[PDB]
């Protein structure tokens, strides 16, 4: 981005699609402590799709890499905190596969 608008609309279109995928459900909002009470001690950079939407809209994502780092961390955080064949991790693999196909579709990583 010396074309910030192209980046913005590309990311917004990407994220709208990611949030539409059925495996995005566990990652739609920040982890509640009433469910995972040590989460925010164990996971020091928590990330979710609501926070990512707020970051997009406030122009946090000035590079594609900042967006991809946060998206990839939604998955890495899941795999660090949850059992590898838990439902949550099942979803994480499904959503990751889907967003890599999208990243590749949008020319955002190599195909």
> In the numeric block, which tokens belong to residue 22?
């059925």
Residues contacting residue 37 through CB under 8 Å, at least 6 positions apart: none
Using alpha carbons only, how large is the chain's radius of gyration in Å? 14
Residue 19's nearest CA partner among 10, 28, 30 is 28
Residue 8's nearest CA partner among 62, 73, 53 is 62
What is the C-alpha separation between 61 and 70, in angstroms, rounded? 10
- Cβ contact 73:48 at 8 Å: no
Task: Label residue 15 exposed, middle or buried (CB < 10 Å: 0-12, 13-18, 19+).
Answer: buried
Domains of the chain: 1-111 (1.20.920.10)
Asked how this structure was determined, the answer is X-ray
| Phi, psi (deg, nearest 5) at residue 42 | -75, -45
CB atoms within 10 A of CB 75: 18
The DSSP result for 64-90, as a single string, is: HHHHHHHHHHHHHHHHHHS-TTSHHHH
């Amino acid at each position: 981005m010396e074309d910030p608008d192209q980046l913005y609309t590309t990311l917004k279109n990407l994220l709208a699609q990611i949030k539409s995928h059925p495996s995005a459900w566990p990652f739609m909002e920040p982890v509640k402590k009433s469910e995972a009470p040590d989460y925010y001690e164990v996971i020091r950079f928590p990330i979710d799709l609501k926070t990512m939407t707020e970051r997009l809209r406030s122009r946090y994502y000035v590079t594609r890499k900042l967006f991809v780092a946060d998206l990839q961390r939604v998955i890495a955080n899941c795999r660090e905190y949850n059992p590898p064949d838990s439902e949550y991790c099942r979803c994480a693999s499904a959503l990751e596969k889907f967003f890599y196909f999208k990243l590749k579709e949008g020319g955002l990583i190599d195909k």
